[PDB]
Design a protein around this ligand. Structure first.
Ligand code: NI
Length: 341
């Protein structure tokens, strides 16, 4: 059965609620982004209205075969009316096509659901600036002060400089980047751009990327692995055995692999700076775990909420244990007392 934190009071609406069958009283199902923990349940047999971004709608139609007549894409930053309720989709700074949803309830209550997000000061100047928000359904993935990580820009600077140095020293090195879902496309695209190469990948991954409206993508990606010196592989193959095996398949074109695993957070963060990151190496294979996050750090999340000043916060992540829930509630109270709301 559907949990309370996926239900929007006073409406017929749910958010990211496709794995519970037919939800009692739901007349429209919203989907924030195309990640499997959120879309789980959708298919060609789904016949209720789904509201989502244009990019998410392209992925529903092509990857899951949801029928067109049931996909309702909405433009961003635009006031829209859904079953008599005003809604706005905002960029969530997560993966491609990911949104936050603003609901303006008939009684005057305003609700923000962040979906999954990486808070940024640029959000303090969207349509959020223009009215009060009473309830916040908040992506609390990293809601503890030990979660610090660098900016996306600093992480991409590290990766480009590392890859460019390695291939310049050895023109026969192959670069490999792991992936298992959409998101973090800048990692592999920036490395290919500095090296003068396309990114080579499976036909299934190329199809997924072509759904994303990324400008000049036919320019950066390919299914011809032989013409590419940056390859994308499933995340599970980013280990010494997986990579040794891949190198065998390349026919003696390459004699070294440099591989990247974009993780979220890893406890090496509390003690080490990005500049200081080192790989794991075995033979002619090196593997770098880089802290590229598409979720808010603690400080980014705290800044957003202290700016928005919501009357009530509803966490959507880490809600399954009493200790996690109590920890989160204690930080929300600090934030409110420090800021004065
Ligand atoms: Ni996500």
């Amino acid at each position: 059965t559907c949990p309370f934190y996926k239900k929007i009071p006073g409406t017929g609406f749910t958010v990211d609620a496709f794995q519970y069958g037919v939800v009692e009283g739901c007349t429209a199902y919203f989907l924030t982004h195309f990640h499997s923990d959120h879309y789980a349940g959708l298919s060609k047999h789904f016949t209720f209205p789904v509201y989502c971004s244009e990019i998410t709608g392209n992925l529903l139609k092509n990857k899951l075969h949801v029928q067109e007549q049931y996909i309702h894409p909405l433009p961003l930053d635009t006031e829209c009316i859904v079953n008599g309720v005003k809604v706005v989709l905002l960029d969530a700074n997560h993966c491609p096509g990911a949104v936050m949803i603003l609901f303006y309830l008939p009684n005057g209550t305003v609700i923000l659901h962040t979906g999954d997000f990486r808070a940024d000061p640029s959000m303090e100047r969207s349509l959020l600036a223009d009215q009060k928000v009473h309830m916040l359904y908040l992506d609390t993935t990293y809601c503890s002060p030990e979660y610090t990580f660098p900016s996306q820009q600093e992480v991409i600077r590290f990766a480009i400089n590392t890859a460019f140095e390695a291939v310049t020293l050895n023109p026969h090195a192959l670069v490999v980047c792991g992936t298992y879902s959409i998101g973090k496309e800048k990692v592999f695209l920036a490395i290919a751009d500095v090296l003068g190469s396309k990114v080579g990948m499976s036909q299934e991954k190329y199809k997924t990327l072509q759904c994303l409206n990324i400008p000049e993508i036919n320019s950066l990606i390919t299914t011809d692995m032989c013409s590419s010196l940056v390859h994308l592989l499933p995340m599970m193959q980013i280990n010494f055995k997986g990579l040794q095996s891949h190198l065998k398949k390349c026919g003696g074109k390459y004699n070294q692999i440099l591989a990247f695993r974009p993780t979220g957070w890893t406890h090496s963060n509390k003690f080490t700076r990005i500049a200081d990151v080192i790989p794991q190496t075995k033979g002619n294979i090196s593997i770098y775990g880089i802290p590229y996050s598409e979720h808010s750090s603690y400080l980014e999340m705290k800044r957003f909420v202290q700016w928005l000043k919501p009357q009530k916060i509803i966490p959507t992540v880490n809600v399954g244990t009493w200790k996690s829930r109590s920890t989160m509630e204690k930080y929300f109270r600090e934030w409110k007392l420090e800021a004065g709301y």
